Structure formats: structure tokens, C-alpha cells
Design a binder for this molecule. Structure first.
Ligand SMILES: [Mg+2]
Ligand SMILES: [Mg+2]
Ligand SMILES: [Mg+2]
Ligand SMILES: [Mg+2]
Ligand SMILES: [Mg+2]
Ligand SMILES: [Mg+2]
Ligand SMILES: [Mg+2]
Ligand SMILES: [Mg+2]
Ligand SMILES: [Mg+2]
Ligand SMILES: [Mg+2]
Lengths: 199, 176, 190, 109, 138
RNA sequence: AAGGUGGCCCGGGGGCCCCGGGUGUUACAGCCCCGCCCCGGCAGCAGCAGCUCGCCGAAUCCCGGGGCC
RNA sequence: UUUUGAUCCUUCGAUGUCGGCUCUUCCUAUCAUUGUGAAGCAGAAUUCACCAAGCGUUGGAUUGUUCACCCACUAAUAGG
RNA sequence: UGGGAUUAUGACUGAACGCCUCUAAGUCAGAAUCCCGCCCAGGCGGAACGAUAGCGCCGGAGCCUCGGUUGGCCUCGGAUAGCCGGUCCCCCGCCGGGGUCCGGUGCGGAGAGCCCUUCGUCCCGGGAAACGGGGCGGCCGG
């Protein structure tokens, strides 16, 4: 009962709206792989936008002031706050339903995870336009853990390859079996093709 | 005048009413593009008022009819002459569009003038509409289409019905 | 407006053997290999014809901005052919008035030490780009020769040494010192 | 011996920006996203369930803790498969974002 | 790497609109985004129709760019497109889609029972094949 | 007459066949206009070839479903 | 809008009214420093302009003075 | 006490504008500025570890209190002016990958999908299974 959204090739606000509305309707969302997020507009102006947000600080006692989260996860979480009524209790319980991770830890690496096409780079931007990765942005603006998440992902990728191979292997054996036995399962397949189940 | 939906073409004729001086004044015809016979009659009166000693009250409209496209399945190249008011100054134009009907073309002119010049519909007056042959067509956007073996693909195919799933596994392809 | 179509052909000689995985081009021949990525550009690269005699490059529905990317490719490919078959010899003469510039090469033409420029104690340890061969010519007093396949890497490394030997706080119209490019050519003529 | 009801969520009340008329309620039914689709559900008996501390009667059985508020799907709302519904007693706002069991048995077939 | 091109005579499958599920030939081109279309044998009138809605196949019945409907009807019957269409696998997975909407409850039950059995047989044979590959390895 | 189909000439791709380029007016593909053949003649008709373009009902009536009281 | 004036909406059952001392931060329309362009720039010295306000911008005689004028060092003795 | 990405600026290749051109796509050097590191505090944030007072574990009965729910899907990686599955006679790696060649491609080796299903019990026959179901010790992976 857990919507697992991949972040790669997605647009920050296009996504976040869809999330907020599901969350408010009780659906237990879980976003992952946020370095894949990419925002429209060139890098330099996106950096201008952020360093302005950093300049904006409380003068008398900065410890109180607005908390500039560097980590891409907490940034996305921030903008969701912006699309939510975080002063109420129902908004807090919403944020309690939400749960975000940078990269991809063990509990979620074993799940087929969904993809919003309605916030996808290939669709919404014209190919001639320019784009910017949130991981690169954060790294120049302070993020201290770029290499680690990469070298953990690579172990995951290899460790994924082996499972996918064993799945293909099963499909080969399965098609070959269906091919040998077909004679004593012809009638059943016949009804599946009468009701368009097997073509 | 708002150009809502799509225009019709109407054949308006009218005249001044009899007087003791002149018992039979001449009839006058026009070609009004308009959505309906009400706004047609109004615009007719405005043009006649600009040219002739004639108001709606002192006269009467004799006939307003709709005029059909006599060759609707042939494709044509229409050539329009304009008269538009800028923010500052007024200017004449000559613009070529490529459509099937007089009405479809006039619509397309309105929308283009709106895009390229922010010209609002009331400012504009239509003075001549002539179907023009490929030989006499000047503008290269038109000229390029006159070729028997025209050929082109549909390269980048943006998806429609985006939200119908809203949540799939497979990333969508756009190359076929 | 949206131009329905543009294209431009390049008729290549039989010596070279090109191939392509989509946009990425690979070119092999005598002097070596050359790959070059075009994924940013968005065009149709058709490799038609027996004897591989020609490349053709379509571009459907382009505006003025997008038409400029055709001939730029044509030229980049032609120069790539020069780089594989013939190569690129960039000559450049050391001009000086009074103080002579003691130049010396390190790492078989990869690195360049330049001493006694205007009698400065600082010394310019300039590094060439990969796939570049510096060399002092013979039968010429002040003459560097940069050889290589890629014109881009050669010429950038040239400008590196050029802007490295630059006169600060001075009237450059008078103090006409430093290395300057003289003759651009090829290793073997055609 | 299975699920005999369609799922719906209590999204919110009927309301303008700065006024909510809470005698009416808004449902967001699962898997239905058009006004063509909502013509089926018309007339159907909804049923908000809840459980409370003390023991109450149960028709045809011993007293359970569970209780109910019955309701009724009035008409469609909007163009994207939301739907108005009017319950016999007005709903508590606690229930925002919870399950209601629309039954089937006033069929329109 | 374009394979299908908009050529006068090319057949297109209508995705949506009033004329859904119908075949139709591209007679002519007006502009960048609008074409003259007609399908005489499938009960579709001569009309305008934007390229947006349509999605073109790999069949090109041959006729002149302005040919009046007569020569199209003859060329269509001459080539015999409709049958080659019905041969295509495309149409078959369309009819399957529709039969699956038409699926009756009794058929739905018979189907579930058919699945259950066909899949127990496959499970048995596949497990013997895996032990067989271990036997081959051993 | 041409947004030029077969024919002719030049190329370029195969060893008689396929693809570009050039004249040109029906030829084994078509388009455009005038006159005469009972507005030439045949159904049908603001066309369930379920949306090529409209305005209407003393020239118009029927049936069904939901809600509230 | 750091001058000055024109205005009277707010407060007259009371907002403590000029200067100096001390102390923080802030603006840039850059005096000097860092990097660079242009000069009727040979070098030196000196002028004009761009990025840039992070770090500096004094000691004293006379006057209640802010302001003014002067001596002395300085890289500089910029303005609010 | 030390780095990075870059501004102003100087430059490369190169069209649009048969030439030219620091820019249009792309690329390079670059600084008291900008960000970080070195340095100060350490979150209604986590950590491995030790010791464990009538008590910690291990294996029935009723009987309080908080509520929500009313089948599961156990995974390649990425591209989109291109992809997927096959094969390789040919070339590398510890069996993995690569090229040639054959099938799909408005995706059907389809998430518009795939899987599990519960009325129960009794006899008997017919098909499939018999190497399978279910009940104890060892061997693999994090
Ligand atoms: Mg309020
Ligand atoms: Mg209960
Ligand atoms: Mg007053
Ligand atoms: Mg007071
Ligand atoms: Mg006081
Ligand atoms: Mg400034
Ligand atoms: Mg000087
Ligand atoms: Mg740097
Ligand atoms: Mg810059
Ligand atoms: Mg750089």
C-alpha cells in the first residue's frame, strides 16, 4: 500500500503537486533517487535563485532563522511544505505519511517502483532548451556526500544485473516448456484466445 | 467585435428610403464577414456611414443572406488586403493565407494579426478577399507547399492522455 | 518560419572507414581513430551508398537557429578526415627584441619550460593537451611545431602557451614580445 | 465471502474559499475519473463506519463496539469524477481522509 | 531513423474522435498541421483532419494528389487493403482488447479455471527442466 | 494550363530493372472552363457513410432515470 | 529623498527637544588594495571605465558647534 | 593555514551572412569576490559497547485498554532524430560483453498487466501427477 516514486528525469514542482494531493488523501508515498531530479532553466540562474534564498537570513540571531537545507531530499521536502498547510495537525500527519531517502537503501531496492510520465523531461521541455541536475547544484552549494551514494549505487547496479539475468533465464525455460507441451494444453489456450487472453 | 468561433460570409444590400426629391435611390451591396446577421447589419452601417450620407435610421436593409462556399473540397490559397490601426498610426497590409474557405482563412488572419501585432479585432477593417493562384502567390511559406511529392515525418511525438494512467512502470516511448 | 527541410552531402574518399552507433561517429584510417559525440544536436545522419562514397545529413522542420547546425557538422567531419589521414602541423615563431627566450621541452614534447621571458624569474611550465607532440624544428632558430590529429586540442594548447606569455601592465603596442602563430599546415600535402 | 462494496475517500465538504457548507460532503471514489463514469453510482447507499469505546447493539448478533452513519450519493460533482453525497447526519471532520463503504443495493440496472 | 513517411496515398488508423477505429487515406496537404482525408469504403466522408489525431501505417495506395473519390474507390478495392489489414497482428490484438471488455462473468469463471490448470502443468515441466540442467551440470 | 502520367534526353544504382535531373499537354495517371442532350438522367436529402457547413416547431411529440418536499 | 521648502492625515489627560562620547550593523554612486579593459599610456608618475562594498579610511590647535579652515604621518585620510 | 564552480576580461574550433566572425550548438585559462574545508557550539536525530538489583528468557486460562484496516505483485540498467528479444561462424573478460544475421515495434516476452482464490462434506469413474504434498538434521546468500 505504498507508492514508490522514482525521481530521475522528473520535474520538481510537476511531481510535488501530485504527491501532496495523494498524501492528503491518505496514500503512503515514498520518493527515492532524488539526484535524478532535474529542473528547467540553466545552471547559473538556478544557482542565483538558491544563493538568494541563502542570503535571506534573520539578522539578530541566525540560529532561529530560516533553515537552509543543503541536502536534495530536505530541499524537496521544503518545497512540499510550501504546498502544504504545515501549521495544522492534518498537515503534520500528512508529513508523517511522507518518507524520503537520498539514493536507495535496502528496504526499497526490492520493489518495482512507479514513474510519473506527466512530469517527465522528454515530454514537457522542448529538446532545444537547457536543464540542470539537482545533485550537481547541491554539491557546489555544500553537499558533502556525492561520491558515497555513487559507489553504493554501483554495487546495487551489479547486484541487480544478476537477478535480472536469472529472470531472463526463467523466461527461456518457460517458453521452451510451453513449446514442448502445447499439445496437451491446446484447448485451454484456445479459450484464452477466444476471450482475447493470449494473443 | 469579438470573433467568436468561426465567421460566416454574408451578402448585405441596403438603401436610403424614398423621399419626395428622389423616389428610387440606388441599392448598395457589401460582403460582411460576421458571426450573424445582427452584427452584420451593424458593421454594414458603419462602413456605409464612413462613405455615404446614410444611417440605419434614415434607411433600411433590403437583404441579408448567407453565402456558401461554392468549391469547399478544393483547396485554395486566399489573398487578403487589410487596414489596421496601430497603437501609434495606421497601416495597410497584404497577407496570404492557405485554407479551404473564405471564412476559415479570415479567422486565421484574425488569429495571426492577434499573435504578431496584438491587434484587437475592432481595429481591423477588411477591404478585399481574392482567391489567388499558385503562380501569383508571393509568400514563401505558401510557395513551398506547391510540390507534387511533398514528404515529411512526425519526429518528436508528445504524448496525449498523460493522466490516464498517471502511474506506470514503463517510461513512454515516442519513436515509431 | 518553419522550414520544411534542409540537407547537405559530404562525398568522402575510399581510404577512410567510418561507422556509427546513432549519433556518435567513429572514423578509422591510417593515422588512427577518431570518435565524436553529437548527442546535443538532434539530426538525421544517413550513411547511404556503396563504396561509402557519401554522407548525407537531414534536418526536418528547422527554424533559423536549427539550420545553422548542419554545415557546422559537415565541416567538423571534414576536419576529422584531415586529422585521420594527414594530421595538423601548427608552426609558431618566438618573437623577441632584446632578451632571448630560452625554451626547452620536457616529456617528449608534452611539456614546455619557458625561461627568461623579459628576464622574469618565474618560469612557465606549460602543459600540452593529450595526443599532442611538441617539437623544435631543425633548420630554424625560433620555431615550435605542434603536431597532432585533433585541431581543437592542438589549437587550444597553442593559445595556452600564447596567453601564458603575456605582458602585464605594459604598452603592448610597443613591447611586441612573445610567441606567435605563423603558418598552419599539414604533415603531408595533398 | 468477499469485498462487497466500493471504496471512497472523504475528501472534504462543499465550500467556497472562505465558507464551508458542511451539510454536504465530497467523495473521491477509487478508479473513476469522468462524469460519464459516475452515472453508474447514482442513488447508492453509502456507509461511514466507526468504532467507539462502549458496547453497542448489533442487528442480528451480540453487541459490538462498532457503529455506523448511513448516507446517500446525491449527484455528480465536477468534471473529474468527484461526487457529492448527503449523509443523514452531518459528518465529523476527523474523518477527513478516510474510508467509506458505498454499497450496491439500490441498483439502477 | 524514419521508416514511415507522410506520402499522398498513405493509409492511417484513426485513434480518436468521431471516426474512431477507421482506416483512411491521406489525399493532400494544406499546411504543417492539417490535411485532406478520405476513406470511401469504410464509411468516412471527405473531410479535413489534423495530423495530431492520426497515426500512420506502412501502406501506400497509389493515386494522384487531387484525384476525385472514384479513382480512390477503385484503387482501394484493387489493392485489397482491408484483408491485409485483418491479417496484421495489430488488428488481432485490437479484437482481443474488445473481447476482453465484452468478457462475460461465466466466461470469466471458465477462464480462471483454464488458467489454473495450464499454469500447474507449466510449473511441473519447468521444475523438471531446472533439475535437468543441474543433471547436465552434474 | 501544370503543383507534368506515361514517351524522349542527361545523370546514378544494379547486369533487362530501380532512383534523381531536363524539355512537354495526354499517351496505359489526372485537373480546369464553355456550349448543346426534357434545370441531361437515377436514388437519397441539412442525410446512422451515429459530427462537410445552419436557422427553427400551432411547421412536434414520445419514453425512461435520479434528487428534494 | 542625507538639503531645503509646500502640505496638516496621526498624537497637545505630554513620544524628553542641539551637539559630543561610547557601540553594532548596514547601503555603494570604488578614496586605496586584488583582477582587468582604454588613453594625446615609451618607463615612471597620472587620467577614464567594468566585476567588486569581504577587510581599512588616523593623531592634533581654534569654535558649544554639526559644517569650516589649517599642521603632521599615510596606502588611503571617499560619501551616507 | 587549503580547494572548487564561476563573474568581468582575453582566447579555440565554427556556421547563420560561398568569405569574416570568442556564440548561434559546443570548448579553454581566470581572481581580496561566492561556496566549502581547517576552527566554536552540538536537534523532541541516530550508534556499537558494558553492567544488568525479586528478576530475564522459554512454553495456558480468563480479563482491561488504543484504534485504524477488510487479497498480493521479490527489483536490470538506460535511450527517446530510436529501442527490445535472439543468435553468432568473428574479437575480449571471469561464464560476461561485443560486432554479423533473424524476429517484434502505436509497445502483447503488454502494469490497459502478472499471480493467489475460501462454500463444506460424502461415494465412484475419467484426464494430469507420481522425481510431487506435508512432517526432523546439514549446505548456499546479507
Ligand atoms: Mg481561514
Ligand atoms: Mg471492527
Ligand atoms: Mg489634521
Ligand atoms: Mg500619549
Ligand atoms: Mg516617556
Ligand atoms: Mg556598482
Ligand atoms: Mg606605466
Ligand atoms: Mg578555478
Ligand atoms: Mg563570466
Ligand atoms: Mg574552466
Amino acid at each position: 500500500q505504498v507508492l514508490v516514486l522514482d525521481g530521475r528525469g522528473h520535474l520538481l514542482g510537476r511531481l510535488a503537486a501530485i504527491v501532496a494531493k495523494q498524501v492528503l488523501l491518505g496514500r503512503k508515498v515514498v520518493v527515492v533517487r532524488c539526484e535524478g531530479i532535474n529542473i528547467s532553466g540553466n545552471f547559473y540562474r538556478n544557482k542565483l535563485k538558491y544563493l538568494a534564498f541563502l542570503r535571506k537570513r534573520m539578522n539578530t540571531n541566525p540560529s532561529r532563522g530560516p533553515y537552509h537545507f543543503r541536502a536534495p531530499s530536505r530541499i524537496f521536502w521544503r518545497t512540499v511544505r510550501g504546498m502544504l498547510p504545515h501549521k495544522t495537525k492534518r498537515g503534520q500527519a500528512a508529513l508523517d505519511r511522507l518518507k524520503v531517502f537520498d539514493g536507495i537503501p535496502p528496504p526499497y531496492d526490492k520493489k518495482k517502483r512507479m514513474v510519473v510520465p506527466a512530469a517527465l523531461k522528454v515530454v514537457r521541455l522542448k529538446p532545444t532548451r537547457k536543464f540542470a541536475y539537482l545533485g550537481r547544484l547541491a554539491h557546489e552549494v555544500g553537499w558533502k556526500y556525492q561520491a558515497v551514494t555513487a559507489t553504493l549505487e554501483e554495487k546495487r547496479k551489479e547486484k541487480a544485473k544478476i537477478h535480472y539475468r536469472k529472470k531472463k533465464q526463467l523466461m527461456r525455460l518457460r517458453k521452451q516448456a510451453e513449446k514442448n507441451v502445447e499439445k496437451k494444453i491446446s484447448k485451454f489456450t484456445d479459450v484464452l484466445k477466444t476471450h482475447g487472453l493470449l494473443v | 467585435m469579438k470573433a467568436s468561433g468561426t465567421l460566416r460570409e454574408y451578402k448585405v444590400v441596403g438603401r436610403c428610403l424614398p423621399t419626395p426629391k428622389c423616389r428610387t435611390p440606388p441599392l448598395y451591396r457589401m460582403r460582411i464577414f460576421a458571426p450573424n446577421h445582427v452584427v452584420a447589419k451593424s458593421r454594414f452601417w458603419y462602413f456605409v456611414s464612413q462613405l455615404k450620407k446614410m444611417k440605419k435610421s434614415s434607411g433600411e436593409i433590403v437583404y441579408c443572406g448567407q453565402v456558401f462556399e461554392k468549391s469547399p473540397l478544393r483547396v485554395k490559397n486566399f489573398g487578403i488586403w487589410l487596414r489596421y490601426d496601430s497603437r501609434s498610426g495606421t497601416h495597410n497590409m497584404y497577407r496570404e493565407y492557405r485554407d479551404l474557405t473564405t471564412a476559415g482563412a479570415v479567422t486565421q488572419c484574425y488569429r495571426d494579426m492577434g499573435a504578431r501585432h496584438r491587434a484587437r479585432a475592432h481595429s481591423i477593417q477588411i477591404m478585399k478577399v481574392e482567391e489567388i493562384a499558385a503562380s501569383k502567390c508571393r509568400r514563401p511559406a505558401v510557395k513551398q507547399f506547391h510540390d507534387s511529392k511533398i514528404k515529411f515525418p512526425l519526429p518528436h511525438r508528445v504524448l496525449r492522455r498523460q493522466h490516464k494512467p498517471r502511474f506506470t512502470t514503463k517510461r513512454p516511448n515516442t519513436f515509431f | 518560419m518553419k522550414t520544411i527541410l534542409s540537407n547537405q552531402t559530404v562525398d568522402i574518399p575510399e581510404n577512410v572507414d567510418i561507422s556509427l552507433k546513432g549519433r556518435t561517429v567513429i572514423v578509422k584510417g591510417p593515422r588512427g581513430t577518431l570518435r565524436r559525440d553529437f548527442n546535443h544536436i538532434n539530426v538525421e545522419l544517413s550513411l547511404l551508398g556503396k563504396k561509402k562514397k557519401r554522407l548525407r545529413v537531414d534536418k526536418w522542420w528547422g527554424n533559423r537557429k536549427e539550420l545553422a547546425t548542419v554545415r557546422t557538422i559537415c565541416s567538423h567531419v571534414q576536419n576529422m578526415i584531415k586529422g585521420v589521414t594527414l594530421g595538423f602541423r601548427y608552426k609558431m615563431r618566438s618573437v623577441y627584441a632584446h632578451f632571448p627566450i630560452n625554451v626547452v621541452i620536457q616529456e617528449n614534447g608534452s611539456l614546455v619550460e619557458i625561461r627568461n621571458f623579459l628576464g622574469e624569474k618565474y618560469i612557465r611550465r606549460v602543459r600540452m593537451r593529450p595526443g599532442v607532440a611538441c617539437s623544435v624544428s631543425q633548420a630554424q632558430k625560433d620555431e615550435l611545431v605542434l603536431e597532432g590529429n585533433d585541431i581543437e586540442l592542438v589549437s587550444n594548447s597553442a593559445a595556452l602557451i600564447q596567453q601564458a606569455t603575456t605582458v602585464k601592465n605594459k604598452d603592448i603596442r610597443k613591447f611586441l614580445d612573445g610567441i606567435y602563430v605563423s603558418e598552419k599546415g599539414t604533415v603531408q600535402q595533398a | 465471502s468477499g469485498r462487497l462494496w466500493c471504496k471512497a475517500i472523504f475528501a472534504g465538504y462543499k465550500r467556497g474559499l472562505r465558507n464551508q457548507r458542511e451539510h454536504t460532503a465530497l467523495l473521491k471514489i477509487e478508479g473513476v475519473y469522468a462524469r460519464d463514469e459516475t452515472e453508474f453510482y447514482l442513488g447508492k447507499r453509502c456507509a461511514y463506519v466507526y468504532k467507539a469505546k462502549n458496547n453497542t447493539v448489533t442487528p442480528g448478533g451480540k453487541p459490538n463496539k462498532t457503529r455506523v452513519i448511513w448516507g446517500k450519493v446525491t449527484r455528480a460533482h465536477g468534471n473529474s469524477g468527484m461526487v457529492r453525497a448527503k449523509f443523514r447526519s452531518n459528518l465529523p471532520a476527523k474523518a477527513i481522509g478516510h474510508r467509506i463503504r458505498v454499497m450496491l443495493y439500490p441498483s439502477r440496472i | 531513423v524514419f521508416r514511415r513517411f507522410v506520402e499522398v496515398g498513405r493509409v492511417a488508423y484513426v485513434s480518436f474522435g468521431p471516426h474512431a477505429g477507421k482506416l483512411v487515406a491521406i489525399v493532400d496537404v494544406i499546411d504543417q498541421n492539417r490535411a485532406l482525408v478520405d476513406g470511401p469504403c469504410t464509411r468516412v466522408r471527405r473531410q479535413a483532419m489534423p495530423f495530431k489525431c492520426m497515426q500512420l501505417t506502412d501502406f501506400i495506395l497509389k493515386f494522384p494528389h487531387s484525384a476525385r473519390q472514384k479513382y480512390v474507390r477503385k484503387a482501394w478495392e484493387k489493392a485489397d487493403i482491408n484483408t491485409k489489414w485483418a491479417a496484421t497482428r495489430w488488428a488481432k490484438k485490437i479484437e482481443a482488447r474488445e473481447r476482453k471488455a465484452k468478457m462475460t462473468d461465466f466466461d470469466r469463471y471458465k477462464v480462471m479455471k483454464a488458467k489454473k490448470m495450464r499454469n500447474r502443468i507449466i510449473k511441473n515441466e519447468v521444475k523438471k527442466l531446472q533439475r535437468a540442467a543441474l543433471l547436465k551440470a552434474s
